[model samples]
Target: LGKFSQTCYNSAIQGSVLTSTCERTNGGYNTSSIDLNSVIENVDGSLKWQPSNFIETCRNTQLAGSSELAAECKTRAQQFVSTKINLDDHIANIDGTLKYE
Candidate 1:
């Protein structure tokens, strides 16, 4: 449980850093910019999950032996989704603005 909690925390931190970097780069300004692959990369450099996978990932993180750690995973998962939405929304706004500009 402790290990999982640490993994969750580390993953969340990495995800946030990735998102922040991507935001600054404007999704790398490519066709795949809005794709999940751009946001969630795997160790082998592949895409991890789509936007819809956030819920399941969060839920799966609850399999910890300790309830407290499980809750922490849940909270971390929620935080992931929140950040995902924030980035997605920001991009959507940019796309909308682009169309009008």
Candidate 2:
């Protein structure tokens, strides 16, 4: 449904502390799920992702809603959408040109 790639899918599932299928939930394709284990269980033990450093800062970190991970995800997603929708210097306009001065 989204631009997620196989690599992304693998990465997603690997750390998917929670699981919910479409069949499990009505209209699963476009439904929401949870990550029970916000603290990732890795070879190093329970790990948490750092909010400041992006991906690496929080390698193997858990983000269960219990820890506001879900809320953080929402905020990040919102920021992504806002950035994508609004023209800026970093990102070119969809029409392949600067959106504004």
Candidate 3:
């Protein structure tokens, strides 16, 4: 009886070991050849429009309506305002900590 049970246990373990092969999957974007500075330049070029352009659209009858331009203008304005507030908070926090030291 003991021999039979030992054989059954060994077979079960051996079957599992043979079926369960370890597999590792590495997943991510392959940005190896992409130029880092070019990405920055692309973003910069997209937002190179001056606030005067937005003002002109509102002020002038000839350049009155551009949904795409307005959308990008508003997006950049919101980003600048939010980023400024975040920078201000970080600066104030650092200033306060320095005073304690």
Model 3's lDDT to the true fold? 0.27
Q: Model 3: residues >4 Å from true position, as ranges?
A: 1-26, 32-71, 75-101
TM-score of each: 0.16, 0.17, 0.12
Residue 15 of model 2: what lDDT?
52
lDDT of 2 by residue, 2-86 (tens): 3333212222243564433333233334333445344444456755552233332223334443222322222534442111112
- Best-first order by lDDT: 2, 1, 3
Residue 94's lDDT within candidate 1 is 59
Prediction-by-prediction clash tally? 0, 10, 0
Q: Each candidate: what lDDT?
A: 0.34, 0.36, 0.27
lDDT of 1 by residue, 57-89 (tens): 454334243222232223543553211122232
Best by TM-score: 2
Residue-level lDDT for 85 in candidate 1: 20
Between prediction 1 and prediction 3, which has the larger TM-score? 1
Q: Give the number of the best model, judged by lDDT.
A: 2
